[PDB]
Structure formats: structure tokens, C-alpha cells
Amino acid sequence: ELVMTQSPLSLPVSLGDQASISCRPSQSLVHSNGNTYLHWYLQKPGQSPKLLIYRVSNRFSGVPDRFSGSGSGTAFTLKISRVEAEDLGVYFCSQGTHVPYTFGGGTKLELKRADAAPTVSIFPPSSEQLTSGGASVVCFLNNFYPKDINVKWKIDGSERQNGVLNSWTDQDSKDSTYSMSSTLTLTKDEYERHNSYTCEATHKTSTSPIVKSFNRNEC
Amino acid sequence: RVQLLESGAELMKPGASVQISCKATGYTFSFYWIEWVKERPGHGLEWIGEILPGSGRTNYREKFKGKATFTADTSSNTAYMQLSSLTSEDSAVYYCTRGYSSMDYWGQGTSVTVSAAKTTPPSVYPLAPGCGDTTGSSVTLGCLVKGYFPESVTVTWNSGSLSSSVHTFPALLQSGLYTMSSSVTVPSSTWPSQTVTCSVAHPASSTTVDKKLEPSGPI
Numbered sequence: 001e002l003v004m005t006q007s008p009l010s011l012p013v014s015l016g017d018q019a020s021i022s023c024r025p026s027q028s029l030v031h032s033n034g035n036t037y038l039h040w041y042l043q044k045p046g047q048s049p050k051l052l053i054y055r056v057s058n059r060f061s062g063v064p065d066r067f068s069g070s071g072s073g074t075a076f077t078l079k080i081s082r083v084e085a086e087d088l089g090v091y092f093c094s095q096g097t098h099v100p101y102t103f104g105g106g107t108k109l110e111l112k113r114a115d116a117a118p119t120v121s122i123f124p125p126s127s128e129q130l131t132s133g134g135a136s137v138v139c140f141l142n143n144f145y146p147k148d149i150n151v152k153w154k155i156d157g158s159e160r161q162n163g164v165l166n167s168w169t170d171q172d173s174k175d176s177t178y179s180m181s182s183t184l185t186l187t188k189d190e191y192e193r194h195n196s197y198t199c200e201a202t203h204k205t206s207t208s209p210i211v212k213s214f215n216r217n218e219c
Numbered sequence: 220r221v222q223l224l225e226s227g228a229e230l231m232k233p234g235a236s237v238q239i240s241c242k243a244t245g246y247t248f249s250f251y252w253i254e255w256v257k258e259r260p261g262h263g264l265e266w267i268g269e270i271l272p273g274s275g276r277t278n279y280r281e282k283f284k285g286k287a288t289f290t291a292d293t294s295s296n297t298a299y300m301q302l303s304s305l306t307s308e309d310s311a312v313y314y315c316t317r318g319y320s321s322m323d324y325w326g327q328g329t330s331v332t333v334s335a336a337k338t339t340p341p342s343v344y345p346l347a348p349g350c351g352d353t354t355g356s357s358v359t360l361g362c363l364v365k366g367y368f369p370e371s372v373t374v375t376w377n378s379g380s381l382s383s384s385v386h387t388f389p390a391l392l393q394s395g396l397y398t399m400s401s402s403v404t405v406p407s408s409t410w411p412s413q414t415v416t417c418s419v420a421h422p423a424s425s426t427t428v429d430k431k432l433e434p435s436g437p438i
């Protein structure tokens with residue numbers, strides 16, 4: 001089908017700045033009837049999406065005048081003349097010309113701040129948990145910016161990928177930072193086959209990972 | 220004053236079928252399509268299909284033919300989607316929307332969660348430093364809240380008296396059970412000299428569990 005490539009994935013702004021968001025369908029959206037069914041929406045956390053612009057350039061009732069859309073062919077653009085606090089959230093485009101209708105992957109409009117390295121804390125399994133035969137190793141990576149971050153687990157120096165659960169917070173209202181929790185779960189049996197457990201955080205603020213580790217024998 | 224009102228959250232066993240409703244008010248029902256959209260964490264938005272009430276007309280996304288079935292009742296102004304043979308891939312928020320020349324009004328969404336689990340209170344595990352490490356001027360503590368069903372727990376750190384400092388990491392469903400975590404950062408002057416407790420409420424099992432945070436080994 002028609003793939004809707006939306007850029008950027010993340011758009012940091014200061015309130016008052018202009019913002020521009022791009023949607024490029026993988027083919028023309030002009031319907032046989034002459035209409036171009038390309039639309040823009042904003043979704044706020046835990047709310048449904050809301051329409052902003054319909055058929056390329058038409059501002060929907062109740063939508064602030066600072067929103068506008070334009071474009072043609074395979075290049076369409078949503079412009080916000082001055083970003084206000086009510087505009088933060090996830091933007092996406094949809095096309096309704098070709099079945100199946102498709103959506104862009106989203107653009108997160110968020111607040112720009114100074115880069116901040118994560119505060120990284122690692123914890124071995126609880127005595128309480130090991131008693132039940134389980135073993136979850138937890139790594140918090142707190143108060144970092146930008147949101148983009150990667151966590152790698154190593155067991156005795158070897159990378160491990162399966163059994164990992166990652167969860168991110170939304171941008172902090174006071175800090176404008178992000179945090180993430182990464183949990184490696186193994187059986188108590190497997191946990192006991194190894195000594196060194198390491199979480200490594202790769203983030204813009206370092207050319208080398210922030211590494212936190214422990215050795216099971218000493219915990 | 221167009222409104223689309225969807226049915227409530229569903230908790231379904233694998234292999235079951237569910238029917239989601241969508242009651243339209245504020246416009247002429249047979250004049251617009253009803254669109255069905257799937258919002259799955261880590262995926263974005265995926266269109267399922269649309270129905271034009273009263274006309275016999277539908278368009279389905281190909282991979283949903285055989286899986287989703289749309290009906291619409293022009294007497295009650297209600298549209299329905301049935302999803303059959305439910306699996307873990309079907310856990311998502313489903314939206315209905317009006318369609319015709321944009322998805323101009325969206326329902327509030329219906330959460331469907333697919334699991335074999337019974338109501339299960341969480342296991343609450345303390346996350347505190349140990350391993351012979353030396354604490355800095357601030358210490359990060361946490362609670363891992365694992366293996367619960369269904370959603371919604373609340374973690375409170377000693378009554379709420381932090382001025383957070385607290386990070387709440389959104390739950391993730393894996394293998395039919397939820398897991399979340401919560402961290403707090405306190406000055407080293409306050410802990411472990413004074414008591415830090417995480418209180419974890421799970422209204423669905425009518426349970427509350429308090430864990431006092433203590434070192435996990437030598438500090």
C-alpha cells in the first residue's frame with residue numbers, strides 16, 4: 001500500500017518557535033474525483049487523536065489559526081507558526097485516497113532543553129524475588145535528554161537481548177527530561193550460572209557508554 | 220456536537236471474540252462512514268476498515284478480512300466491530316472515527332487486553348543499593364511491581380511527601396501479566412537513616428502492599 005513517510009520523528013522546540021512537519025506518501029494522493037485526501041492530526045497522551053487540517057490545506061473548525069497545511073504530489077507539510085503549550089504531542093498525517101488508508105509514523109513535538117547525561121542505577125534481584133525462583137535485574141536511567149537512548153545488557157561480558165523489558169516516561173513537566181527503566185529477567189538457576197551483570201547506556205551525551213555493573217558473588 | 224461513544228475496556232481470553240460498539244450522535248448516521256483504527260504500543264496507527272451505515276458497503280484492510288467484521292444499525296445509530304480468535308497481537312486501543320473527507324471526529328477508544336491470567340496482585344520487590352558500593356550524596360531507590368493483572372496499580376512513596384523526584388514507569392504487558400517500576404531519589408542524609416517505603420495499591424485485587432527500602436547488602 002501507500003506508505004506515509006513522516007519526518008522528523010522528534011521535533012524539539014522552544015515555545016514560540018516555528019515548527020514544520022513533513023509527510024511524503026509513496027505515490028500521488030489525488031483521487032479519481034479530483035480531491036486530495038491528505039489530513040493532519042494531533043494526539044495528546046491518553047487522549048484520542050484530533051483533526052487539524054483536512055484535504056491538504058483546510059483548517060478544521062476550532063483549530064487555532066497558527067496551524068496551516070500545504071503541498072502536492074508526494075510532499076506535504078504541516079506548519080505551526082508559533083508553538084504554544086497546547087500544541088505539544090504527537091502529530092501524524094493520514095491518506096484517505098487509496099484503500100487501505102494509512103498513517104504516518106508520528107512526530108513528537110516536545111520541549112528543547114540542554115542535553116543531560118542519564119543517572120544510571122543498577123540493582124540485583126531482590127532476596128524476596130530469588131526466594132520465588134525468579135531473578136530480575138533492574139537498571140534505571142534517569143533525567144536524560146534527548147529522549148533517544150539505547151540500553152545493552154551483558155552477562156559475564158556477553159551481550160544478552162531476550163527477557164528484557166524497557167519502559168519510558170514521557171517528558172517531565174518541570175525538568176523537560178526523560179527517564180527509562182530496563183529490566184532483565186532470568187530464572188534464579190540461570191542467574192546463578194553467572195557473575196558479572198552490566199547495563200550500558202548509549203546516549204548523545206557520551207561517545208562511550210555509561211556502564212553500571214555488579215558481580216553476583218559480592219552482592 | 221458530533222460525538223462517538225465507544226463501549227468500555229475489555230479483558231478477553233485468547234481464542235474468544237469481542238464486540239466493540241460505537242454510538243454516533245450529533246449528525247446523520249447514514250451520511251458518513253465509520254472508520255476502525257488500531258493503536259498498538261510500538262506500532263503507531265493501523266487502519267482496520269470502514270463501513271457506510273445503511274448502504275451495505277465496507278472496505279477492509281486485506282489482513283483483517285476474516286478477522287474483523289463491521290456492522291451498523293441505522294435504528295440505534297451504532298456501529299460494531301467484532302474481532303475473533305483473539306490473541307496477544309490484538310491487545311490494543313481500538314478507535315472508531317467518522318470518515319468521508321477526513322477522520323474528523325474520533326471515539327474515546329476501547330482498550331482490549333488479551334490474557335489467560337486471573338486477577339493477580341503484584342509481587343513488590345525493593346530496589347536498593349548494596350554490593351559494597353559507596354552511596355553518593357543522592358541515592359536512587361525503586362520498587363519493581365511485577366506479574367499483576369489487570370492494569371492499574373498506584374505506587375506512593377511515603378504518603379506522597381517527596382516533591383518528586385519520583386519516576387513512574389508505564390506498565391508493559393508481557394505474556395499476559397503486567398510489570399511496572401517506580402523510582403525515587405533521596406539525599407543520603409535521609410536514607411538509610413530514615414524510613415523510605417513504597418506503597419503499592421492494586422484496586423482490582425483490593426490489595427495494598429508496603430515495602431520498606433533497606434540496603435540489599437553491605438554499603
Ligand SMILES: O=S(=O)(O)CCNC(CO)(CO)CO
Nearest residue numbers: 037096097318319320321322
Ligand atoms: O479521506 S478519508 O475521511 O480517510 C476517507 C475518504 N474515503 C473516500 C472514499 O471513497 C476517498 O477515497 C471519500 O469519501
